[PDB]
Structure formats: structure tokens, C-alpha cells
Amino acid sequence: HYPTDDIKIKEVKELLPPIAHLYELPISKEASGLVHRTRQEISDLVHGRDKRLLVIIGPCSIHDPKAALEYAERLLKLRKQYENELLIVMRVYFEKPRTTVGWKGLINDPHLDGTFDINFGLRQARSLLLSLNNMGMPASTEFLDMITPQYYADLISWGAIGARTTESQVHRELASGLSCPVGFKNGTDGNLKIAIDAIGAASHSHHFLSVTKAGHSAIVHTGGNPDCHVILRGGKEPNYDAEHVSEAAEQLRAAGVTDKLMIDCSHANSRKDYTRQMEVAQDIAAQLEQDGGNIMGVMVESHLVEGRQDKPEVYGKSITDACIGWGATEELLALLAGANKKRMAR
């Protein structure tokens, strides 16, 4: 009997089931309310019913929860201060997808040493998310797979599907069952169609494989997600300007889906240069003054300290994509609250 099973597997180990984590860290009355309301409020932006600017803002990836709570602390004050112009939600991404060897995120490797203590990772991520909501900061994250959401999705008010997974059918099937509103990024080369197609798909009922709260293999039957939109993320060339928005809106209308879209100031719209994020936010501001009726949100990569670092030596600086610092963050948010005050007035 020749072996044919698990030939290239080093190990398969049981994780604690989602219920174990839900038992230790149940969502509280206050978190529940924040999440439920924030999702509704985002739905309204998505469907053109309110004209505030959704701002998804925070670290490229979280590596230290201490600093993330500190960042949240400062961000909350601005969330309240711009609450009439801006709906600020924190970026709480645990991993950046990548091609080469490197750190696989807080869930996967919370100790940043390669011991992959995933049970700790998932506990830590739920805990941070619960603390954020408990202090009054709503959270957003990208879902990279079909299982992790069972651990902490109940605490997420806005989810993302990245450029690298927007065309994947099973990620669309996931999105169709996510309790939060979902943004689909255009593709790494600037293809927008894949994202538009994703919205259509994610709005219908689907089936996909996952585990139950008790941790057992299962088939999930979704009811459809009416709250999806596209995110302009750039490509071979940037796609943030009025000519690119207008054309995106036109494609969206022609597909019978929402022509309210979000713009990412980072990644390929900055040319992977964090200093250009402000240029992009400036261009967005300028659009919100002239007209910009098709814009419902913006994405921004921001931390306490500006820049990137290969090891986590320095407190509050990304080890993934380069972020703008806190001062640049005060300026950008102010700029956007100012421009949008004027759009809302009209």
C-alpha cells in the first residue's frame, strides 16, 4: 500500500473551536450596539442615503496590541470630532498577504518568532477587537480565508476582500454571508470588472465550506449581502481621479449595482510611497468640493510613527507597508472633514 495522503504535510493540529473563544470573550452589550449601528450607518453610505465619508484608517497590519489600543485612543477623539462629516472606522488587519518568505501576521504568528501559536493568535485578535469596540472604536479587517471569520466576525463592522482574492469565487461566496458591509478591491493590474462582478455575485445566495462555532466541518448557506461596494486601489496606473471615478461609476450603473465607491489612498495609488497618500487625499478633497457624488469612503494606512521597519524594533511603526505618522494623520483627516462639510452642505 503506497502512501498517497498528506505526503507534503508536516503536521495537522486541532485548533480550539470558535466557541471556546466565544465562551471566554463573549461580545458585550456595548460592543453589540456599536457593531450593529456602525454596520447600518455604513449601509446608508453604500446606498447613497447619507453623505458622510467612510474612513477606514489605521496600521497596514497590527503587530502589537498595546500600540493599537494607543492608536485607537487617539483616533477615537478624532472620530467624535469629525462625526458629522466623517464615519471613522479603524483598520485592524492582522496580516498582509505576500509572495516571499516573511511574517504571516498576528493571528498566525503572534510571537513574531515563527512558533505559529495560532490558538493564542486568534484569542489575542478577538481580545483586541472586543477592547476596541468596548472603548467605542469600530473595527474593520480583511478576511483572507473562510474559517477565521467564525472566530471574530461578530466584532467587525466592515470587511475587505483584497485585490488578490476579489476574483476568487469562494471569497465571493464568503462575502455574500458576512454580517458586515464588504469592499472589493480592484485587481493588482487595475482591473475593475472583477470587483464589479464580485458585488453582483456577493449579493446572491451561495454555499461554501467552513466550520461551525463548535469547530466542525460544515456547509454554510448564505442569504446574500446587499451592502457590497468597490474600492479603487490603482493598478499599472493610479485610479483615484475624477476621470477614473466617473468611469467606474458608469460601469457600476450599467451593471445594476451601487455607483458609490471607496478610494484607497495607499498601495498602488501612492505608488507604494506613503508620502503620496496625502496627494491622493488632496485630490479626493478637490473632488468633494467640485462634486464627487460617487465617493462614499476612503482608505488610509496610518500608525503612531511614520514608515516601515524589517524587525519590530521601534514602537508604533509598521513591519509591513509604510504608513504615514500621526501628524500626517491629523492633517489628512482635517482635510477630508473640511472638504466633506462643504459637499454635505450642497
Ligand X SMILES: N[C@@H](Cc1ccccc1)C(=O)O
Q: Which is nearest to 38 in space by CA: 56, 62, 21, 61? A: 56
Instruction: Choose which of 113, 219, 310, 345 interacts with its own copies (CB under 8 A).
Output: 219
Least distance between Mn ion and beta carbon 162 (Å): 9
Strand 158-161 vs strand 139-142: parallel, antiparallel, or unpaired?
parallel
**Of 140-148, 307-315, 320-328, 334-342, which segment contacts its own copies by CB under 8 A?**
140-148
Out of Mn ion, its own copies, ligand X, none, which partner does residue 127 contact, by CB within 5 to 8 A per kind? Answer: none
91 annotated among ligand-binding-site residues: yes
Q: CB within 8 A of 95, min separation 6: which ones?
A: 61, 104, 105, 106, 107, 108, 142, 144
What residues are paired with 194 via a beta bridge? none
Which residue's Cβ lies closest to Mn ion? 321
275 binds its own copies (CB under 8 A): no
Q: Count residues near its own copies (CB under 8 A).
A: 90
Which of the residues 85 through 124 are near its own copies (CB under 8 A)?
A: 97-101, 104, 108, 116, 118-119
Other Cβ atoms less than 10 A from the Cβ of 171: the count is: 23
What's the maximum distance between 2 C-alpha atoms anywhere in the chain?
76
Euclidean distance between CA atoms 88 and 79, whole angstroms: 5
Interface residue list for ligand X (CB under 6 A)? 5-7, 9, 12, 146, 149-150, 153-154, 177-179, 210, 220
Hey, what's the cell of 305?
A: 510613527
Contact indicator for 107, 172 with CB cutoff of 8 Å? no
211 binds its own copies (CB under 8 A): yes
For residue 33, the surrounding DSSP H or E stretch is helix 29-46
Instruction: Choose which of 134, 179, 251, 282 interacts with its own copies (CB under 8 A).
Output: 179
Alpha-carbon torsion, ordered 95, 197, 267, 87, to 10 deg: -80
Amino acid at 339: A
191 binds its own copies (CB under 8 A): yes
- Which CB, 150 or 287, lies closer to ligand X? 150
- Which CB, 3 or 327, lies closer to its own copies? 3
- Which CB, 98 or 221, lies closer to Mn ion? 98
**Of 28-36, 81-89, 271-279, 331-339, which segment contacts its own copies by CB under 8 A?**
28-36
Out of Mn ion, its own copies, ligand X, none, which partner does residue 60 contact, by CB within 5 to 8 A per kind? Answer: Mn ion
Binding-site residues from annotation for Mn(2+): 60, 267, 301, 321
